[PDB]
Design a protein around this nucleic acid. Structure first.
Lengths: 431, 443
DNA sequence: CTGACCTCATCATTTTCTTAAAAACTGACACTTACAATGTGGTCAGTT
DNA sequence: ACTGACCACATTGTAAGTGTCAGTTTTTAAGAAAATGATGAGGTCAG
């Protein structure tokens, strides 16, 4: 339009320098007549110019110029949950129920921790499922476990030591790489972590997964748990973090109570996750904190907002306020149990070479290969067979184990393709 | 003793009994259990339930079984040892004008049974679609020149700023605007880094003080200055760009607050447009325009800093859900964003004109410092009373207001100056709101 | 030989799953009205 | 005499609206049917 065409047509002379600073622009009320353009167009162009300060105007009118991967048939790892059996038509029914024109004032942020209903529901569910004592005020909610962990890191300080078990999930190493703190490895036997090693050391906060040990699946006894609680009881400024990795997926023996139940003097914090059950890409997590530390955190981090969208909070609290969470959880448990039974029975024949180690509960198995080939050749053959696999040597930074044990997960593989996938992998290995 | 009437099966009551007997201390270390047959006969129960309870006990660790022999306890216990009627933020966006029924259609179009293989996460940089449409929108609305692969996505501005802080280092010295938007100081209050406060006049940041000091990175808004609405001139922009160019380890960050709501003067080109030396990083927002509660944002980087960010944070995962990301990609793909933006622009212009015209009459004791563009206006009360008394009297009539005392490190003017916003006040209530607040005050 | 590891059988109560018709829904083309955009023309107060 | 800003009214065309319709979708009380806690009677193998 001419409205800004004149603006550009004159801006070219101010920028290029047809007239220097202080020189008058061609005219006022006369340039319009000479160019035949209407006066209003000139007025608009000059106002646009003085908006950006290309030309400065004296109060009385004078013009002062200014100077994942592309080709994979399959992939194996415990991260990928199964996705086909998600009841979309049950999610949409609550979504269209929660976001309606009538219900405004849910589009603006508030309750910096999270929606009060969501916190109350989480407290009730945790207390009546995992035996975890809690309070509605006690819980905090954020998006991704990473943000909660970084909040904890900034809350504690840069003057503490962290204990990470060597065969484990490569998270705390990657977080502590950036931060000043340093980590101390710890080996783990078939009954738990080397609590004797910890009590023979001056570590302060240690990262453990009592319910199920990634990836070997070992379950901590009561004696070692009691010893660890007494170890935390000794001093006044030591804390133990409990990670709820993959509970509620145990088949035979119900499920094991969480370590937070044993806490009586407030030295255990309950960390959890929410995106390895419902959706891998919905990004909700949660955390509980002991009364003094939670009170301090409330008094310390007032100015942050929530991190996960309020829409998701409301829709999901309405989703599992009615009770569909139990139904979905049970259906997933059944399908995963059947998948695991089929895979184990299929692989049972090659028992001389493949010793399955671990326990049934979980979403994955770890298998040791007694063949003479090297693990690099194994993974390269798997990828060259259009079915990539993820070895365990990356999950532990110590010396590579001579028997190359390769991790296998099956959440991604469809129920009807399990046998074909296993057959293709084993044919690739040359059996 | 045993009810048999509780919903929990004997498969659990037997466990409860044995657990309380072991933990109370009536069975010691290494003691023999009655195995399966004897206990099953004595308790007139099936073998299956007994073996299930015993195997479950073994799994949790109380007792250990040696094959073809009896159980043996492995559990030696030492036991322990008032009523806000009219909100006033210069941050709220209107709710009623929001087309929900256009959101719903895209939501139902994107998430279906066929659309699996999307619940699984990935591409923490953001799927190439969302990036390419956001880059195209920025290029054709703000004159910003950057390929799609530079941009990133994160949940809000705070997370992006924390990632940038970790990426750059703790040795730098940061610069902020005048007493104003209280974000960077609140973030740096927890980090070793330090900030150098500044003063700005009615035209913009004093670039001379910048060039006479050795600050490393300085934070300011080229398009609209919170809360005075000042616009930086071309001369000061050029001088700031030269100052950033002068050294080789100094960066300028650009934060456009509401640079798309300029009513008359089209859209002022963004500072990134003039950068040819690759020294500015763009910071935007999707939450001061569309929804203030979905928590989305975006940010742009130059090529070497892009490589550094790629090599440094390659093992994170985005905090923005793929559901919202894809549905909003579809939202802007067909052009509905422009229509929504225009509608909001027009309604906000009407609201501003109405409120200004209403406030015109009482010009004797009050003034208007803010300019036309923006979502809020700054006024001074020349009544002989302190700001805190005005705020508490505002509370006294169930209509609270938020002054500039918290915004200001110093004391600007003894006659209090107070910020008012109108994002969440309906059109047919502005007159009543202003009337009741003026009644609460001396007028 | 009594002692203890184990695998099927088939019984039961109470939760999950499937099919139809009857309900409310919302995309597609259509058209009737607006309405704020630029734009021209002709004013205005008050300087100097 | 040189130039502040405030009306008129003209135009194109995007946005705003009600209309009946063809059309995918949602709700319901059945129906049926999977699964588990439970009783039974066995399989081998040791010492």
């Amino acid at each position: 339009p001419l409205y800004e065409q004149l603006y550009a047509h004159i801006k070219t002379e101010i920028t290029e320098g047809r007239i220097g600073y202080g020189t008058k622009l061609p005219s006022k009320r006369k340039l319009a007549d000479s160019l035949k353009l209407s006066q209003n167009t000139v007025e608009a162009a000059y106002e646009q110019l003085v908006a950006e300060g290309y030309v400065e105007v004296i109060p009385r009118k004078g013009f002062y110029v200014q100077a994942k991967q592309d080709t994979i048939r399959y992939n194996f790892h415990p991260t990928h949950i199964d996705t086909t059996s998600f009841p979309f038509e049950q999610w949409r029914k609550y979504f269209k129920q929660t976001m309606c024109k009538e219900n405004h004032r849910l589009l603006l942020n508030g309750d910096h921790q999270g929606e009060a209903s969501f916190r109350r529901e989480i407290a009730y569910y945790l207390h009546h499922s995992r035996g975890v004592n809690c309070t509605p005020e006690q819980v905090v909610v954020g998006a991704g476990v990473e943000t909660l962990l970084q909040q904890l890191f900034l809350l504690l300080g840069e003057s503490k030591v962290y204990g990470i078990e060597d065969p484990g999930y490569q998270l705390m190493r990657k977080l502590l790489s950036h931060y000043p703190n340093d980590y101390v490895p710890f080996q783990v036997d078939e009954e738990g972590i080397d609590v004797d090693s910890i009590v023979r050391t001056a570590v302060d906060v240690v990262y453990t997964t009592p319910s199920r040990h990634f990836p070997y699946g070992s379950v901590l006894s009561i004696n070692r748990r009691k010893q660890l609680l007494h170890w935390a009881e000794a001093h006044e400024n030591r804390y133990i973090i409990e990670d709820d990795y993959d509970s509620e997926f145990r088949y035979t023996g119900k499920t094991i109570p969480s370590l937070q139940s044993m806490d009586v003097h407030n030295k255990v914090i309950y960390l959890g996750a929410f995106s390895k059950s419902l959706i891998p890409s919905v990004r909700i997590s949660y955390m509980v904190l002991p009364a003094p530390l939670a009170h301090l955190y409330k008094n310390k981090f007032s100015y942050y907002h929530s991190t996960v969208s309020r829409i998701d909070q409301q829709v999901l609290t309405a989703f599992m306020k009615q009770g569909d969470f139990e139904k979905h959880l049970n259906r997933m448990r059944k399908i995963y149990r059947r998948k695991l039974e089929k895979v184990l029975s299929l692989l049972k024949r090659y028992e001389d070479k493949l010793l399955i180690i671990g326990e049934r509960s979980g979403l994955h198995i770890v298998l040791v290969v007694k063949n003479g080939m090297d693990e690099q050749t194994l993974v390269e053959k798997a990828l060259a067979a259009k079915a990539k696999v993820y070895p365990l040597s990356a999950y532990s930074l110590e010396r590579a184990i001579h028997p190359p044990q390769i991790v296998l997960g099956f959440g991604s593989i469809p129920e009807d393709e399990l046998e074909e996938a296993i057959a293709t992998v084993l044919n690739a290995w040359g059996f």
